Design brief:
Number of helices: 5
Helix content: 10-25%
Strand content: 25-35%
CATH class of the domain at 3-87: Alpha Beta
Number of strands: 12
Radius of gyration: 18 Å
Structural class: alpha+beta
Distance between the termini: 44 Å
């Protein structure tokens, strides 16, 4: 495509499932965007995928600026149990999707009054599983399971924010102290124990 808009037609995709091929990634995004009506014309919006195997991220290149922007709305989409972290390239300079997709929960969890910290999670649970645990109390607005920056594996804690701020206290009362195997969950507002 045009060299002039290249930076506005590419996205960083982190937290990709181990072993995923570039072809699988491309088919997944192309399918998800088409099935979701996130396309502006017939055909496949994603033109290329470059995976960095060692760091578990990919860069996707799109055929248009507007479809790239729409793809940002898939941040947090679940792919093989993993919440995909979709971000602009750091060298991108304008941009906000004009359509939200059901069933996608952002992985951007800004510090805020009702941001929750969830500690003591068993390390074998994937994003989808921890998210299902939390969504028992209500729909989430944002969620991120912290991963080992070397192996991409869970570090045993997460942060989230519910759509309804009133669920925050219900989740604390229900989950704080709960026993999971030998672990005991710590669920509190993240501001309380922030570094």
């Amino acid at each position: 495509g045009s060299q002039m808009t290249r930076q506005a037609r590419r996205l960083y995709v982190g937290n990709i499932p181990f072993g995923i091929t570039e072809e699988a990634m491309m088919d997944f995004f192309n399918a998800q965007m088409r099935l979701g009506g996130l396309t502006q014309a017939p055909g496949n919006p994603v033109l290329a995928v470059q995976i960095n195997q060692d760091k578990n991220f990919a860069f996707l290149e799109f055929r248009s600026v507007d479809e790239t922007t729409q793809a940002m709305a898939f941040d947090g989409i679940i792919f093989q149990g993993q919440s995909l972290k979709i971000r602009r390239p750091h060298d991108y300079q304008p941009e906000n999707p004009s359509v939200y997709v059901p069933g996608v929960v952002s992985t951007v969890v800004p510090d805020s009054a009702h941001k929750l910290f969830i500690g003591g999670l068993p390390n074998y649970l994937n994003d989808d599983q921890v998210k299902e645990l939390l969504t028992s109390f209500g729909p989430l607005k944002a969620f991120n399971l912290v991963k080992d920056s070397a192996t991409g594996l869970s570090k045993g804690y997460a942060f989230c924010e519910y759509v309804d701020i009133n669920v925050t206290d219900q989740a604390i009362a229900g989950l704080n102290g709960m026993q999971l195997g030998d672990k005991k969950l710590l669920v509190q507002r993240a501001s309380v124990g922030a570094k």
